[PDB]
Amino acid sequence: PPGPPGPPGFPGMKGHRGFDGPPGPPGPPG
Amino acid sequence: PPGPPGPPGFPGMKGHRGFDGPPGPPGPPG
Amino acid sequence: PPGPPGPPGFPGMKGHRGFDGPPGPPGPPG
């Protein structure tokens, strides 16, 4: 008959790098 | 008679994209 | 009669945080 289950599969690959952050806010009025 | 354990499972799915970077620092005062 | 595949691998790690955003622009002169 069939044997028992095999081992876990491989862990998934790490995801893509996040997008760069937005520009900071305008500085205060002069 | 029972055969051997089975093979590894399927890999995990790829991770999601990282978080957006933080905003940059305020610009200089005007 | 090797057995079935095992369980799915671990879900992948989330990606690296994005890089910091650029400095903001100078404030208004006014």
Side-chain angles (χ1 to χ4, degrees), chain A residues 1-28:
Chain A
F10 299 155
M13 299 291 308
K14 183 166 190 73
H16 297 126
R17 188 175 83 247
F19 302 125
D20 286 29

Side-chain angles (χ1 to χ4, degrees), chain C residues 1-29:
Chain C
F10 294 153
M13 294 298 102
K14 191 182 181 53
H16 286 144
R17 181 179 62 82
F19 286 106
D20 286 16

